[PDB]
Amino acid sequence: AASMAQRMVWVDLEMTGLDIEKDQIIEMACLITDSDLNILAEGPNLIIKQPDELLDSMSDWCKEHHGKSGLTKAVKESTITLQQAEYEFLSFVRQQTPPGLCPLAGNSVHEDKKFLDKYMPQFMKHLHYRIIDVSTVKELCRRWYPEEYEFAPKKAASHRALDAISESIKELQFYRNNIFK
Amino acid sequence: SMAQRMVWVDLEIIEMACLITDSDLNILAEGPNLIIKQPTITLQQAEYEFLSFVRQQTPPGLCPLAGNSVHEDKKFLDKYMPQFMKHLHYRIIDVSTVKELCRRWYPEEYEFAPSHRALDAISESIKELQFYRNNIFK
DNA sequence: TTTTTTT
Ligand SMILES: [Mg+2]
Ligand SMILES: [Mg+2]
């Protein structure tokens, strides 16, 4: 009840860039945890089709990283539309969380929220407006617990959405274990 | 030390306020407290006042926006004050993130945690984060 | 325990 309302909706996106006016979502993953960061449910992990012209125009960082990770190719091969992706993610969180009560969670997840607010508004209607930004806790750890910050996880296994989620949960667990009372 | 400062902002016609704290949440400098029309001084002049202020107070690109759910403020400022946001880091210090963790992990303490003026909103946010540091951090 | 990057 209150336990269900204290779940967290962990999301990570890959995009063609950081320009909300032109860039698009190309990968999205979602995990549900309970309030103590135990993974309760693994949602869709989807590569979303976007136009060839947009991928050929990406920044140098995106061209390099999304090419080497295999993401650009998978996007070109994907048959999943933005609208179908949104359908699957909304179906998932409907099954897992009470409407309006649970926050998005992840590293600097406000950026993902900007993109989801634009491109998956029906998904975002299911969520709270507050976020659990693990990078806020990162910045506080850096300032207030610099010794501990030396040992915190920082880098995911890949610049792919599901690996980023996995690392973000592990980083928050590290902060809970090392800098909270 | 200067790289660990924080740029506190709040937006509430829109009223915008800003101030600077050090890493330990001590207020170092009060910035502009201004009123603009939603898109009394123009948006561009307001943006210059805030950008000039943070240029005098923080190193470029290094310091985060801070406040309660300050990602909402950041969405607005990213669109309408992009030259101000260029001076700042892309990470934020979202006090409401610490609130949500307090509510889950420290419910007893949460029960004691901390006007509609923007400067008052900043003051409350700093006090709330200080309460969390004092009561739920190691 | 880590490996200065929101994409
Ligand atoms: Mg990430
Ligand atoms: Mg990534």
Author numbering:
A (entry chain B): 36 to 216
B (entry chain A): 38 to 49, 60 to 86, 114 to 188, 193 to 216
What did the paper state?
We obtained three complex cocrystals, referred to as Rexo2–RNA (Rexo2–D199A bound with a 12-nt U12 RNA and Mg2+), Rexo2–DNA1 (wild-type Rexo2 bound with a 5-nt T5 DNA), and Rexo2-DNA2 (Rexo2–D199A bound with a 10-nt T10 DNA and Mg2+). Due to crystal packing, we also noted the π–π stacking interactions between T5 nucleobase and Tyr122 of the neighboring Rexo2 molecule. However, based on comparison of the three complex structures, Rexo2 appears to interact primarily with the last two 3′-end nucleotides, providing the structural basis for its preference for binding and degrading small oligonucleotides.
Human RNA exoribonuclease 2 (Rexo2) is an evolutionarily conserved 3′-to-5′ DEDDh-family exonuclease located primarily in mitochondria. Rexo2 forms a homodimer and interacts mainly with the last two 3′-end nucleobases of substrates by hydrophobic and π−π stacking interactions via Leu53, Trp96, and Tyr164, signifying its preference in binding and degrading short oligonucleotides without sequence specificity. Rexo2 contains four strictly conserved DEDD residues (D47, E49, D147, D199) for binding two metal ions, as well as a general base (H194) in the active site for hydrolysis of the phosphodiester bonds in nucleic acid substrates.
